[PDB]
Amino acid sequence: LNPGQRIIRDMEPVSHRTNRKPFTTGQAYSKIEILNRTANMVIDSAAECSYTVGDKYNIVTYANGVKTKTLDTLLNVRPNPFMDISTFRRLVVTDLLFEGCAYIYWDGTSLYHVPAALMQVEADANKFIKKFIFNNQINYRVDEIIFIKDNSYVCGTNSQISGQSRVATVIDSLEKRSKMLNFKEKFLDNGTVIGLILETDEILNKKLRERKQEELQLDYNPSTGQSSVLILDGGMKAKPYSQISSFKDLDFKEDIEGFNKSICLAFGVPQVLLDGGNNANIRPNIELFYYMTIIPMLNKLTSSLTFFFGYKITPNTKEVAALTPDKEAEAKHLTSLVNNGIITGNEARSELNLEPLDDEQMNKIRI
Amino acid sequence: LNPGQRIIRDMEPVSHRTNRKPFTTGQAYSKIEILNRTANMVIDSAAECSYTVGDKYNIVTYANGVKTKTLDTLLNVRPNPFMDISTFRRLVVTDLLFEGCAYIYWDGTSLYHVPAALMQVEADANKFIKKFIFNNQINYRVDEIIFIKDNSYVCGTNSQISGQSRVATVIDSLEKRSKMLNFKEKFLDNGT
Amino acid sequence: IIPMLNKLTSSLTFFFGYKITPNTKEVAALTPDKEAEAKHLTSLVNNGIITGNEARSELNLEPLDDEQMNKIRI
Amino acid sequence: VIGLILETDEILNKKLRERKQEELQLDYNPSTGQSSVLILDGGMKAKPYSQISSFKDLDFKEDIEGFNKSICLAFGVPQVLLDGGNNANIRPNIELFYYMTIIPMLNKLTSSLTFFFGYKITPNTKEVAALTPDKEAEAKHLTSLVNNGIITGNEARSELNLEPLDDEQMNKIRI
Amino acid sequence: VIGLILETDEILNKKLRERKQEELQLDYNPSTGQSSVLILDGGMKAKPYSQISSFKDLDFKEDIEGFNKSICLAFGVPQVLLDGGNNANIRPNIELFYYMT
Structure with a gap:
């Protein structure tokens, strides 16, 4: 065993949640379309892939006595007696994406999903990990849970536990963009426009002054009115006013575009997939996205399953329509x-x- | 069984509707051209696709005793004696698109569509789900309903129930655009 | 479209126990x-x-x- | 942001002054209001003000882009991988990234392992999907x-x- | 940065002057505020000020690009390897770098 596992345990006895703002995450997912589209694309692409169980590695594993056909049925056909394969895969993938870690409980004959928002992993003094605590109470054990972790750099030291979520990184850009968009709409709503300004040095009959204000405004409108010439008598003048704050100074296109590109970069979806382009733009970008983004994400899970069961499990699409x-x-x-x-x-x-x-x-x- | 299904039930006992503004949704669909075109395109493209029934998996399922030919006729030719295949598919797809989830009731020999705007899914303490409540009254059961759910992240926890509707994300940009267009037309009208 | 129909086909496969997959092969735009x-x-x-x-x-x-x-x- | 500035040389009833401020702001907005012509009586004038600090002087796109370029350069990832591009560009950049960046990094580890155990150990992908x-x-x-x-x-x-x-x-x- | 400059020729109660400075600044921001029209009474004026030193005179892109290119030239690494390009840019530049340097 490792002589210095006690020191590593003392450095970080328990896992730390890395999704600092869950409510803001939910609100942004519910009311921002770029986030919704990118997250749904990633989850659906990950859930579309199938799995293959191959050779058996001659090692001692946590779960033993499981045949190849049972694993093939569980991973592909129907994991739980009571839940879909698609729902199970999408839940695991969204847990992994939104929260740094994901867990899958192992029963006697079936794999049950456990939410990662409540799991807290407790490290062990001696080997690796002592016990898993679902919120509280249950205290699962270890032999019954498959653990999937994303690479994380929390505080100062990198952790053997926990995991850092890609969606938190994006939370500031959406807030920054939404503030500017609301600023633009409120500037449009609160703005004032003036067409004509007349000045006089005497107190001319407020009521008939307002009547003349209505009359000139209606008459001189070319949509409803047939007047173009104005004669000012009695000493009344016309102040040549200008426009103080115009709408052409507010150039928000580049900043909003940059925020959108940054979000797409953070999730990993190529721009061409969202926009669309020529054939050479279409197919290589689909291949790049699927392979280089999704396949490592599924590779973590497949390596964890290979460690758990002792069977060579690798991602295998070979059926995905976009990869035809x-x-x-x-x-x-x-x-x-x-x-x-x-x-x-x-x-x-x-x-x-x-x-x-x-x-x-x-x-x-x-x- | 899962030792901790009770906690998951306690976190989210019942489903939550995610179509916050239905009336605004309907008005925008009825009076906006881009929304109408895109929604119609998606629904028609989804309804165009057919289905194929192949090999039989040796598992114990909720509905048993159904032959391949009968299932093929239901999915392809005519699900109900009283409604079209195209109408059935379009209704299911629009339910799935506008509301996070969609439902298909299973009768003795035919599949009946049930709207998802009224059903509420009640989670179970032990296994997965106890019953489906169509608005009120019926309490269908579970064995008679096919459940389709979109991936959702509501509040803090991702739920095994509910579902997040794609059209609500739009019910913000549409209003932002309509306000600007009306502002332009009224500025043109009121100018001198 | 295909993931959207894939959710439905997976649910139907779980419900009835028959391998059901989306299959266009007739759509005019996919000729x-x-x-x-x-x-x-x-x-x-x-x-x-x-x-x-x-x-x-x-x-x-x-x-x-x-x-x-x-x-x-x- | 200011839309209109009116100045007077007398103390005209602060309360009704504020009432007129809100009234004009509501009326002369073309979104909610149907007024375009204004008449100034009693000697009240209108100062032709301008905008001192605008949002068009803050041109930050190039500098932020340059910082992103420098970060991508520092780690070593070709920019086409992050942005995406054509057929010809999309594969050679993947090969360049993997080889030039990753393979020396794993080569240090493999050389150390070869020293430690005495078995010739070389990095071998031959399975990576992006290198198909x-x-x-x-x-x-x-x-x-x-x-x-x-x-x-x-x-x-x-x-x-x-x-x-x-x-x-x-x-x-x-x- | 300054938004508004108002000038008066009398000593108008420093404390309430600062209170009005806060009030106008909060009220006239379109993000948090619903006012657009201002009325000046008592003789207060508005000086039409400008901006002396802007951020558009500081054009530093070309010089920084020149320094980076000079460093790359000094070491010998082709710029295409750092930036990335098309296949005809990728492979010949790799060969040139390795061989020549």
Whole structure:
């Protein structure tokens, strides 16, 4: 064992919540459209991916006696008797995204999801971790929980526990943008416009003064009125006024655009996916997004599951519609490989997502 | 079973409606061109897609005894004896889009649509969910309803129930734009 | 669209126990290019990976009850 | 922000002065109000004021952009990965990032491990999704090398991340 | 930064003067306030001031870019490697850097 695990325990006995503002998070998610779209895109893309259970690693694991078919059914078909696979995956992904850590409880035969807003992980003096405390009371144990953690740098030292959430980082930019937008709308609402100003040095009959104010305003409007010439008699003048505060000084386009780009950068969604563009803009950006953003996020979970069960579990899409390969190039390279002898026909059929055919010459290499 | 389902029930016993402004939603849908076009495009595109029933998974399900052909006819040809497949799909999709969740009641031999604006989902202390309350009265049960939920982050905790509607995010920018347009037209009208 | 329908199909699969997946294959806006489809289908059929009946099914035609269309040519 | 400034040389009834201030502000707003013409009687004037400090002098876009450029440079991530771009740009930048930034960093660790244990340890991705090679070019060069005789079939299968097949003619060079 | 300058030729009660300074500043901000019109009584005027030193005269982009380019030139790293570009920019620049430097 590690001789200095006690020191690391004393440095940070328990986990710390890293989602400092949950209510503001919920309000921004509920009333800001960029946040809603990006978060929904990330969660749906992560939940779309499937899982594959392969070889068995000869190591001692927390959960033993579990067959490959049971894992295949749990991860793919239906984890709980009472909950969907899509709902389970989306809940786990949103827990991981909004909160630094995510947890999945392991029952005798099924995987139950546990919210991460109430979990508090307690470190151990000797090995790694002593116990998990769901809010309070229950005190799960350790053998029954799968632990997924994002890399975090809290306070001074990096933590073996806890985890830092991507959505908190974005919370300031939305506030900064919303303040400016509300400022613009309130400036428009409270502004005043004046068309004509007349000045006199005498007290001219307030009532008929207001009557003349109405009369001139109606008459000189070119939409409803047919007057253009004004004759001022009695000494009345016209002050050549100007506009003090105009709406052209408020140039908020660049700042709002920068805040939007910063939000998209923080979540990791490429700009082209949100806007749309040419084919060369479309497909490589989809591949970049899916692979380089989602696949590490699922890789954390798959590594945790591999540690827990002892079976090689890797993310495998191979069905996602947005990752559908080009038909012509796929056919060309598969047929070339099959004809030249590198791969059998059955392997090509499997890669085409078809079913292997029980022939004789398709299980032997042609040349 | 989960040893801590009681705590999750205590946190969120019942569902919460996330369509805060329904009347403003309806008025904007009725009198805004971009909202109408985008919503119609999404709903029609979702309703265009068909469904395929394939292999049978050897698990114990809520509804058993249904053959492949009957399910295929229900999903594709004609769900109810009294309503269209296109109308059924469009209703389900618009319920899912405007309200966070959508529901489909399961009768003896056919699928009946139930609006999501009135149903309230009651969580269970032990397993997942106790009953669905259609406004009031009925208390359907659970075995008779298909539940579809969008991912939601309400208040502080993400709920296993409820769901967050995409159209409400818009009911802010639409008002901001309409105010500016009306300001422009009235400034033009009142000028001299 | 497809994730939106995927939630519904996953719920239906849980409810009924039948693998239900979204499948367009008929949507006019998703009509594939005729020439590229013909090229890749004919290459796959001739080289031996895919039988003729599978190609007809992917062309949204009906299977034809022949003898040499249910066996791999080469 | 100020819309209108009126000045007078006499003390005109503070309370009704404020009432007139709110009345004019409500009336002359084109959003809620239908007045455009104003008459000043009794000697009240209007000072043609201007704006001292505007929001157009605060041009901060370039400096903030430069700070972002410097941060991205300091860590080493090509900017196209963060922003996104065309077909040609999107793959070479991924390769440049991974190789130049990551691989030396893992190379330090692998050299230390080789010193510690005495086994040649080298970083090997060959599985990273973002480094997935082009299918057509890979097939072309592998098939050419296999057919011409430089590389056996088993080596090609291994490079394709498949499993070696226990045949006879795949462990001997064809020509 | 200054928004309004009002001038008077009399000693008008410093304390209430500061109170009015706070009141006008809070009232006339469109973020928190619903007033747009001001009336000056008693002889108080408004000086049309301007801005002496602005932030637009400080154009430092070109000089900083020149210094960064000079540093990169001194070490020998091509600018494209630091910024990133197209494939024809990526590979030849990598080869040039490695070889020549």
